Amino acid sequence: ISEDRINTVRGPITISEAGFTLTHEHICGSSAGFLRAWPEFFGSRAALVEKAVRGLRRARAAGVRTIVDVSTFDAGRDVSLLAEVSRAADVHIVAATGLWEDPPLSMRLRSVEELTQFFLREIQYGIEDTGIRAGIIKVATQGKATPFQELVLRAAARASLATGVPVTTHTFASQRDGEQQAAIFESEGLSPSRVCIGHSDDTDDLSYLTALAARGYLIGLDGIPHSAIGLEDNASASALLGNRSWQTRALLIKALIDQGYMKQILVSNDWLFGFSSYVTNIMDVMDSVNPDGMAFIPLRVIPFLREKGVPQETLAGITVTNPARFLSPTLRAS
Amino acid sequence: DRINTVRGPITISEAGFTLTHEHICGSSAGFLRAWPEFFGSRAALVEKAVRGLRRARAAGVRTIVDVSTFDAGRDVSLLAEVSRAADVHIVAATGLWEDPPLSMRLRSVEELTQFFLREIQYGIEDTGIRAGIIKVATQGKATPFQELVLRAAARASLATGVPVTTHTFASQRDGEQQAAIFESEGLSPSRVCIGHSDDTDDLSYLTALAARGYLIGLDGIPHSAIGLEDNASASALLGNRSWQTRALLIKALIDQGYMKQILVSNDWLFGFSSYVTNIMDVMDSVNPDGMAFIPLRVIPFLREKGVPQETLAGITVTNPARFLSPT
Ligand SMILES: C[C@H](CCC(=O)O)C(=O)O
Ligand SMILES: C[C@H](CCC(=O)O)C(=O)O
Ligand SMILES: [Zn+2]
Ligand SMILES: [Zn+2]
Ligand SMILES: [Zn+2]
Ligand SMILES: [Zn+2]
């Protein structure tokens, strides 16, 4: 019959309003303060807003209703930008706290207790002076965790336990980062069902993925359209996007389904509409690869899996119900 | 004719007593806006900075140069608020310091030049406040990116006439490599201040640079961990040389004929998030005078050593005016 609230950049929404949800996206992958200090890098702020609003309208027309922007502070998350484009496009956006790959000195020097207070601040009080409350915590490793990355993982688990909001991660999938991340989260008493091990489609190792899924972890197959096939002459695009086909990444979805782990899958594009933390031309290159942007999951991956025999009701469970269970906050500890 | 401040243009004569290397708040890009509770509160930091700038003004300071860059967390709206409430001019900086984010580290020399020019000619962020100085940094031998920054800083200075000021590892003689790269871009040494030079006692390093026309920034005079020997983190940052030892370098350079190329400052700050958590309280406990330390302590110390008042006015008033006035 019933087919609690999630915080978005426009306020609370019910779990039913979330609908088709892309769990790992970015409006703009940047650096803290950068969009405000140098909007001309993106053409203009107004150009970036219009480009993002068109992109979100394209995804909405394909059925997307919510995206989770997993841009942290140090990824240059600007929640006022997310709020504006969410209003104009009528697509819900969940904002993130946490820390990504590029913390500044003022973060890198902090204690696990201090990082915990920062993450709690952005969840419980709001981000900057906007009142917008984060609905997920993003963390990152790139191989074995640095000492600071450990602190971030522990502060994230402690913030998650105190607030009920879930944790999503960036991995070097080929290095099986998810195993160490899981070990640290579990040492903090975090439930695996509140953790998504992200960028897991970057690897073909199914024994690694199914082992985490069997432990209750969510498996983020979140970069399906990332591929430099056809751009072999472009070293920067090839290093970023990899030489594995979108079809190859997509078949991991079906492989997890066939092995019984449908309930552990999350799917996304890991797209963006501006991109300043890499080489200068990279957004233009990615847009030439995938004009559909965030609409790639519903317009290309769903019809692909449907013809391989995956039932629509299974795909709806992965893209609607699974994110809903992920993002719905659990009870606060104590 | 005019110098750009966070309140707008001023004439050269309005600058008066000027501290050439200071910080309202040493932080990181976006950090003050995202986590102001680190400093108690934004209002508390404002209040602390206004009280400190008002004391410096009562001691005779009329202008400070805030050499906080984008990546040092410069918030020009904070600078504008505290300058207005303390009636002390503040000159804002562009350039890049020792903590550039990916979106900066990945940029070309041409792109960096455009960014520095924007903050000088157009304004910082959406405030309309234009930078009046370019800040650069090395910590020993320059990284490849730091070489780009020095070159972009030189090109921006040439296009606008605003001067360049540097962070050095003085005991590795960084000013020499900085001078080499600047001169390879055609930049005039008289447009360059080699900063943190009071961090070394090697006077021959300093005088060779000055004999080439450079300005020498003796800018951390009150930095000292004397009495804090059981504090490893303060000792590493502040050093174990006394403020008297740093101040004697001012007299030494005067005695060697370089009084017209000395720039003096405190390198102080009212908030400090880019180091260990307690560091601002520790620094305040050893120098409560803050930015008023130069006029309240260093001026009387030098006058007792026999430096005449006209020499001290030339260093604190005439030199900064000549340096900041765009060419
Ligand atoms: C598009 C994505 C944004 C950053 C991230 O997901 O780590 C990428 O660069 O891989
Ligand atoms: C006090 C000074 C502020 C930053 C700078 O001058 O490099 C420091 O942290 O060394
Ligand atoms: Zn990532
Ligand atoms: Zn991402
Ligand atoms: Zn410095
Ligand atoms: Zn400084």
Side-chain angles (χ1 to χ4, degrees), chain A residues 1-2 4-35 37-53 55-57 59-141 143-171 173-331 333-334, chain B residues 1-32 34-46 48-138 140-259 261-302 304-327:
Chain A
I1 297 173
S2 317
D4 204 338
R5 283 196 296 195
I6 303 158
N7 277 328
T8 76
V9 301
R10 287 194 291 179
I13 67 162
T14 62
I15 324 303
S16 325
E17 282 176 284
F20 194 125
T21 300
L22 299 168
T23 51
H24 186 126
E25 307 296 338
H26 311 267
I27 299 308
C28 181
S30 193
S31 299
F34 188 86
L35 177 61
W38 196 357
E40 294 72 31
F41 182 92
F42 311 90
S44 79
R45 197 181 169 88
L48 176 66
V49 168
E50 172 64 11
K51 180 171 190 279
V53 166
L56 289 176
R57 277 182 194 151
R60 207 197 184 280
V64 177
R65 294 297 177 268
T66 300
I67 72 160
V68 177
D69 185 333
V70 299
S71 301
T72 59
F73 165 81
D74 61 300
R77 170 209 65 205
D78 178 354
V79 290
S80 75
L81 169 68
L82 279 49
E84 178 176 3
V85 304
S86 174
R87 288 185 192 283
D90 193 28
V91 173
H92 304 293
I93 302 180
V94 176
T97 192
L99 289 175
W100 175 68
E101 293 173 338
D102 193 29
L105 275 175
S106 294
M107 288 298 175
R108 294 205 298 282
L109 274 275
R110 305 278 72 81
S111 66
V112 63
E113 295 85 9
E114 285 173 323
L115 297 170
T116 305
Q117 287 312 297
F118 173 62
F119 300 164
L120 291 181
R121 197 256 195 212
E122 303 203 305
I123 297 162
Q124 299 178 319
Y125 173 83
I127 292 169
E128 290 151 342
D129 59 349
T130 70
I132 299 169
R133 294 156 158 74
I136 189 166
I137 311 150
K138 174 64 178 298
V139 300
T141 60
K144 205 203 180 244
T146 66
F148 180 72
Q149 277 161 350
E150 279 213 49
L151 303 181
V152 175
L153 300 176
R154 301 192 177 277
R158 297 172 195 188
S160 174
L161 287 168
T163 62
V165 314
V167 177
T168 193
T169 84
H170 168 122
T171 67
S174 65
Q175 301 285 265
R176 304 169 77 128
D177 288 8
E179 286 171 359
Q180 186 189 16
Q181 300 183 340
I184 296 176
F185 292 142
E186 288 170 36
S187 82
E188 295 282 331
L190 195 60
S191 171
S193 79
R194 309 303 297 163
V195 174
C196 183
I197 304 295
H199 300 331
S200 296
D201 57 320
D202 284 356
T203 181
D204 296 311
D205 189 348
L206 270 169
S207 75
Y208 155 71
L209 295 185
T210 60
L212 286 166
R215 292 164 62 181
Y217 286 92
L218 308 199
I219 307 297
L221 308 174
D222 52 37
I224 310 307
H226 290 216
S227 156
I229 292 180
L231 291 83
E232 285 83 6
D233 46 281
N234 181 335
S236 57
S238 291
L240 174 68
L241 302 168
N243 60 345
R244 290 159 65 249
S245 63
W246 76 258
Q247 293 91 339
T248 289
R249 298 168 172 277
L251 281 164
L252 293 167
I253 305 166
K254 172 173 157 51
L256 281 190
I257 290 173
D258 288 342
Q259 295 196 38
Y261 299 106
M262 176 275 178
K263 292 284 163 75
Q264 316 305 132
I265 300 173
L266 298 170
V267 174
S268 212
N269 307 277
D270 194 20
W271 212 245
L272 42 58
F273 302 119
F275 193 175
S276 66
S277 57
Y278 197 47
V279 299
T280 289
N281 77 345
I282 188 50
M283 186 78 275
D284 286 346
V285 177
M286 292 182 53
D287 288 336
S288 79
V289 169
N290 172 30
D292 281 330
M294 297 185 182
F296 188 87
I297 290 312
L299 291 181
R300 307 290 316 281
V301 175
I302 281 182
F304 175 74
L305 299 172
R306 277 292 296 118
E307 201 51 34
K308 285 234 158 30
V310 184
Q312 176 53 42
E313 296 91 359
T314 294
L315 296 173
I318 296 171
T319 58
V320 180
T321 311
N322 281 5
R325 300 290 176 262
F326 185 42
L327 298 168
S328 295
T330 59
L331 289 173
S334 157
Chain B
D1 181 21
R2 305 226 144 80
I3 296 163
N4 285 324
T5 74
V6 296
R7 287 158 63 198
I10 66 166
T11 64
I12 316 136
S13 61
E14 288 181 274
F17 198 124
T18 299
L19 297 168
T20 48
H21 183 129
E22 302 298 341
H23 302 272
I24 298 304
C25 178
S27 190
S28 297
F31 185 90
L32 178 58
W35 195 6
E37 297 79 19
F38 185 89
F39 313 92
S41 92
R42 189 179 174 92
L45 172 66
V46 172
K48 176 175 179 183
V50 166
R51 285 187 268 106
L53 277 186
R54 282 183 187 193
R55 280 184 299 263
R57 193 197 198 274
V61 176
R62 293 295 176 268
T63 301
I64 77 169
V65 185
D66 190 324
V67 296
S68 310
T69 56
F70 168 79
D71 63 300
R74 169 210 66 205
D75 180 347
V76 281
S77 74
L78 175 70
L79 275 55
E81 182 173 357
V82 176
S83 157
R84 289 189 199 268
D87 201 28
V88 172
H89 308 294
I90 300 181
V91 178
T94 188
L96 283 176
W97 180 63
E98 72 184 58
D99 194 27
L102 275 163
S103 298
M104 288 297 171
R105 299 200 299 274
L106 268 281
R107 305 277 73 82
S108 64
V109 69
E110 291 89 1
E111 289 172 318
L112 292 173
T113 307
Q114 285 319 302
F115 172 65
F116 297 169
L117 285 179
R118 179 223 211 253
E119 303 202 306
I120 294 163
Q121 300 175 316
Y122 178 81
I124 293 167
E125 291 152 338
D126 55 6
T127 73
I129 297 169
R130 307 178 162 177
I133 195 169
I134 308 153
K135 170 64 173 296
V136 298
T138 62
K141 191 178 193 292
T143 67
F145 181 70
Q146 287 159 351
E147 291 200 28
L148 302 192
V149 174
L150 302 173
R151 293 192 190 273
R155 297 173 191 190
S157 169
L158 288 168
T160 67
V162 316
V164 180
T165 191
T166 88
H167 166 118
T168 72
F169 199 149
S171 76
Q172 293 200 33
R173 300 188 165 219
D174 289 3
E176 285 169 18
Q177 176 176 38
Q178 296 177 353
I181 292 170
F182 290 148
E183 286 164 34
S184 82
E185 294 288 329
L187 185 57
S188 157
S190 62
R191 284 286 91 189
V192 172
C193 179
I194 302 300
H196 299 331
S197 290
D198 57 317
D199 282 353
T200 184
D201 290 311
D202 193 338
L203 197 52
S204 71
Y205 158 64
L206 301 183
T207 56
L209 282 174
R212 295 160 67 178
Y214 289 95
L215 285 80
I216 310 299
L218 312 173
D219 50 37
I221 310 300
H223 286 210
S224 184
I226 289 186
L228 313 168
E229 285 83 13
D230 60 351
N231 188 327
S233 63
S235 303
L237 183 78
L238 301 170
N240 67 356
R241 290 158 68 249
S242 59
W243 75 260
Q244 291 97 337
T245 288
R246 296 175 176 272
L248 284 155
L249 289 175
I250 304 169
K251 175 184 159 47
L253 283 180
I254 291 168
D255 290 340
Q256 301 302 119
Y258 299 105
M259 75 181 179
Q261 296 159 252
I262 302 169
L263 296 175
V264 181
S265 211
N266 307 276
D267 191 27
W268 211 246
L269 64 181
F270 302 114
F272 196 173
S273 68
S274 45
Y275 198 44
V276 312
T277 295
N278 76 346
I279 185 61
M280 185 81 278
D281 293 334
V282 179
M283 286 176 68
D284 288 337
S285 76
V286 289
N287 176 30
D289 282 334
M291 288 180 192
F293 185 84
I294 292 306
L296 292 188
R297 304 293 311 285
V298 178
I299 294 312
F301 172 88
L302 295 176
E304 195 278 335
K305 296 291 207 250
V307 184
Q309 180 50 48
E310 318 80 71
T311 297
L312 298 173
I315 290 173
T316 55
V317 183
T318 310
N319 292 0
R322 194 198 315 118
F323 180 62
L324 294 165
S325 182
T327 37

